[PDB]
Design a protein around this ligand. Sequence first.
Ligand SMILES: CC(C)c1noc(C2CCN(C(=O)N[C@H]3C[C@@H]3c3ccccc3)CC2)n1
Ligand SMILES: CC(C)c1noc(C2CCN(C(=O)N[C@H]3C[C@@H]3c3ccccc3)CC2)n1
Lengths: 314, 314
Amino acid sequence: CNPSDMSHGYVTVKPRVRLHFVELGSGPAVCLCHGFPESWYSWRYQIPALAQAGYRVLAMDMKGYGESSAPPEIEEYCMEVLCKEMVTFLDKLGLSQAVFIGHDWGGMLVWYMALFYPERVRAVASLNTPFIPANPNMSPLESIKANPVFDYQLYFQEPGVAEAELEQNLSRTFKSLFRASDESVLSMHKVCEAGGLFVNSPEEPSLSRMVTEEEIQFYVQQFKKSGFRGPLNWYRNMERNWKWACKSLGRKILIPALMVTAEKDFVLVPQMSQHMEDWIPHLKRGHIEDCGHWTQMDKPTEVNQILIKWLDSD
Amino acid sequence: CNPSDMSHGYVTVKPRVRLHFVELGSGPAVCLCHGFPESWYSWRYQIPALAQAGYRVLAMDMKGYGESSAPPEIEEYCMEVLCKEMVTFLDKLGLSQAVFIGHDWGGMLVWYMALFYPERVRAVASLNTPFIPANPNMSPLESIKANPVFDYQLYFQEPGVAEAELEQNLSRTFKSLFRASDESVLSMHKVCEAGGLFVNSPEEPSLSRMVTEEEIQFYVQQFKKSGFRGPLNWYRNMERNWKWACKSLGRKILIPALMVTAEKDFVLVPQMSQHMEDWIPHLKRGHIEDCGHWTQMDKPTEVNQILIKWLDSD
Ligand SMILES: CC(C)c1noc(C2CCN(C(=O)N[C@H]3C[C@@H]3c3ccccc3)CC2)n1
Ligand SMILES: CC(C)c1noc(C2CCN(C(=O)N[C@H]3C[C@@H]3c3ccccc3)CC2)n1
């Protein structure tokens, strides 16, 4: 993939908030939303394949990332605000509807789009990230306590702290993160006790079989623009997000929906998706074997075939 | 029309050259190509209307204009090089085809797209600009010295001369040009001998019925960035354009085609188009009464009606 071979698009959704996207293809509009800590570029294997399949692909830099605005305020990254901004995004593009496909934090964003703005969502697909309805009798902080695999999320809370570590050496950050599940070097269990996220793992990590040095260097140049404050702010709105998700009053998602799970993602575990058809009647499923968290890079061919088949029928 | 309420796209068609466009709507892609000395903004009335009619509108800043690159070299603005760039533009957006609609210089560009790249052009429409096959005997220089109202074209030839007059007071330039035919304050007859283009015209011209002061100021701000050199270079490739056109002399436009004529355009007179069915037998037509050169600005409601009706049928 080569950025300078792409169309680059810009939409101002709020006086000083500008979302950047890459665009390829003609046909119905498909909006791709990456997660943490990623980029439009994370969709590099899907963009040409979806375009070739007869779709108009808009791959976003999410708020806080790449060439999009990265305001420093925490409240700018609560889910309600990010969702309304995606609505304004469609209005300025003149799109009445789009298909939304997301991954990770982007997966969370697309479910809420479908929950609260189903008239603007043609169909919705998520990689890894399940839709779990708000629990009115359990805060998000009490969910993190029960499951110690979400310990890193507490380390992400204090502004500045996680930034300094992820920003210290960008190349190292991305080489340590972007790895197949069997190549993992990360201690996710004890992050607060250790003091750092990488503080037990190599100083000069090897290149994962998933990525080339060129691809890693692309992420390095992108994160030099605004760093990690914007992206990490996505984790600092738990109570606000909880209170907003309660306003749905147990309504259902009635549009065509796809949940694709990945066998080896140890944070967004497949079983976490098990009760979804209760809240989502018209839900179809995909499942990818031998696939870790970084689905699009890990199993691009499988992702492509699943998304294109679902798109052509639903 | 508020620019900040639009989606802005950028495509690098070559190292030194990026093209800017504005994008609205979904459906088949319609590319709009303005003339001299205009802007994507000259399409302000057609953009929302075509999008609402169910089309995906791409409104270009042509090479040398607004946010597009404006290289100083004269050879960068010959029709051959401009057309190849339009094709590269379609390639990088991943569009196999587009409907092309042009006015003025943009009119002549879209005809040539239809001739040399029929496979990339779904349908072709021109406002004001007729399709006249290349005359292999007389040069374009010979046609000018045979037609008195084309005198300003020789005045445009010497690099720096028309530039300095046009860029002197930008506000005056646009208020003098952008007028109805009955409000006209310019003589195209004797420009070369009698100083320049504005020598005989008011210093503080009134605002035309077609434009607001706010609309004039948008053009002013746009032309402050590159001035008139790029735009005028369009007029400085006559021998090359004639040479290139001759290579097409035998072939025929077989795609759907629309020619729209403005009764009161005193440079692009309707009768100039009278023999077009002799090369395009299936040519559909439109005609707009009491309408000058600045067609989109002058009779936008008629322009919209004519374009949408043709788009929905062929
Ligand atoms: C449904 C709930 C459990 C849920 N789903 O997604 C989430 C969000 C929070 C948890 N999620 C999250 O942190 N994603 C992690 C892979 C990325 C990461 C973690 C540590 C270090 C580097 C990168 C994914 C997004 N919560
Ligand atoms: C086939 C021939 C007749 C032909 N068709 O288009 C042309 C081009 C050259 C002539 N054309 C041209 O100059 N357009 C004039 C409106 C612009 C203008 C004139 C004076 C001062 C300011 C602006 C229109 C485009 N030639």
